Amino acid sequence: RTIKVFTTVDNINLHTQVVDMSMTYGQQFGPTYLDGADVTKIKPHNSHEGKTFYVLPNDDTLRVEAFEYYHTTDPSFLGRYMSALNHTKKWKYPQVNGLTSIKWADNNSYLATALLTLQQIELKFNPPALQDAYYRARAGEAANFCALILAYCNKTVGELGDVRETMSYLFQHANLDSCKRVLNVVTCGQQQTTLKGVEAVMYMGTLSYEQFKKGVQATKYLVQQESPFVMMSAPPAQYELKHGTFTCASEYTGNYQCGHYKHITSKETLYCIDGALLTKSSEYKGPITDVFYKENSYTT
Ligand SMILES: C[C@H](c1cccc2ccccc12)N1CCC(C(=O)NCc2cccc(F)c2)CC1
Ligand SMILES: [Zn+2]
Ligand SMILES: [Zn+2]
Ligand SMILES: [Zn+2]
Ligand SMILES: [Zn+2]
């Protein structure tokens, strides 16, 4: 007639529940999840004894636990998170060239590119959930991390995606306090701008950091930079990537609707990771759209 299970919103604060085995999880707790799976319309099974189930933050204390773990106020988050998990737990996360990648599935090229990128850039997350999941991802267990990335990016599994937007959302939940950017426009008169938060490390309209320092078009040029990396993005275009001149890059092949992402890293030679696939070469030219670089500080 009963079993003892645990209910949680963060899988940190576990709450003991006695569950009647004659009623579904849905009737007793509302939407209920077991490792991403929806058990709402399912009655308890004997194998569920002792197991931890996700519920939704329907009171105030659960909302606070959810905020302090996910740094989110969105109630659907948990639900969306769970959905992603149920799929991303079945993905494969092989090591390629010393990095955790994703075997291709559900149109996830942009997630694999973003993940490899994050692993090659100095970035600490703010939300405890992201910290724990990213730690586990770097160790080859990236299911939770990817499901969370989907959840924060308000994207569902199987849906094509943009790496630059993904990095945008991620950086918003990252510690960029030590970052600052300063630019100028050369319109009559001095027009210096200081940029903080995401816009201190992201730029759209050229792949070339050095061009950003020389100026793009009125002309705008980088006066000062304090960050551990930078991301230079531009609409996909033919571009040459020379070993040692960059850290990594996103290649996009296709049109605005249907496309494919590959990842270019600068180790000893140029490496190209495409999910589980890996190739090497001495040089590379192709359609690039994001290029990452390592900076500590810059002054024009
Ligand atoms: C980096 C690239 C991009 C960025 C900027 C301009 C682009 C022009 C043409 C093609 C790609 C361009 N980016 C790649 C991923 C794209 C994407 O997620 N497409 C999904 C999609 C699916 C259906 C309709 C749609 F408008 C968009 C969005 C665009
Ligand atoms: Zn509690
Ligand atoms: Zn059964
Ligand atoms: Zn906090
Ligand atoms: Zn699936």
Residue indicated by tokens 């490390």: 201
* Residue located nearest, by CA, to atom 21 of ligand 1: 257
> Is 146:88 a contact under the CB 8 Å cutoff?
yes
- Nearest residue CA, atom 24 of ligand 1? 257
Q: Whose CA is nearest to atom 18 of ligand 1?
A: 161
Ligand 1 probe mutation, 233, 256, 258, 289, most atoms within 8 A of CB: 256
**118: Cα within 13 Å, side-chain hemisphere:** 32
Nearest ligand to the C-alpha atom of residue 129: 4
Q: Which domain covers residue 239, as residue numbers?
A: 180-299
Residue 137 Cα to ligand 2 middle (Å): 26
Between the CA of 32 and the centroid of ligand 1 the distance, in Å, is 35
**CB-based neighbours (< 5 A) of ligand 5, an ion:** 87
List residues bridging with 174 in a β-sheet. Answer: 125
Q: Please give the backbone phi and psi of residue 145, each rounded to the nearest 5 degrees, phi first.
A: -60, -45
Ligand 1, atom 4, lies closest to the CA of: 235
d(CA 142, CA 150): 12
Within 6 A (CB) of ligand 1 lie 160-162, 235-236, 252, 255-257, 259, 289
Closest by alpha carbon to 69, among 176, 163, 151, 143? Answer: 151
**Token pair 């590379």 in the structure block, residue:** 284
Intra-chain end-to-end CA distance of the chain, in Å: 73
Query: CA–CA separation, 228 vs 214, rounded Å?
Result: 20
Given a contact cutoff of 8 angstroms between Cβ atoms, the answer to whether 148 and 85 are in contact is: no
Q: Return the ligand 1 atom nearest residue 290 CA.
A: 1
16 CB-near residues (< 8 Å, 6+ apart)? 4, 5, 6
Distance 114 CA to ligand 2 centre (A): 33
H or E stretch covering 151? helix 143-152
How far is CA 83 from each of CA 26, 32, 35, 151, rounded to the nearest angstrom? 16, 11, 10, 9
From ligand 1's centre to the CA of 236, what distance in Å?
A: 9
Give the CATH number, domain containing residue 285: 2.60.120.1680
Give the DSSP letter string of 61-126.
HHHHHHHHHH----THHHHHHHHHHHHHTTS---EETTEE-----TT-HHHHHHHHHHHTS---BS
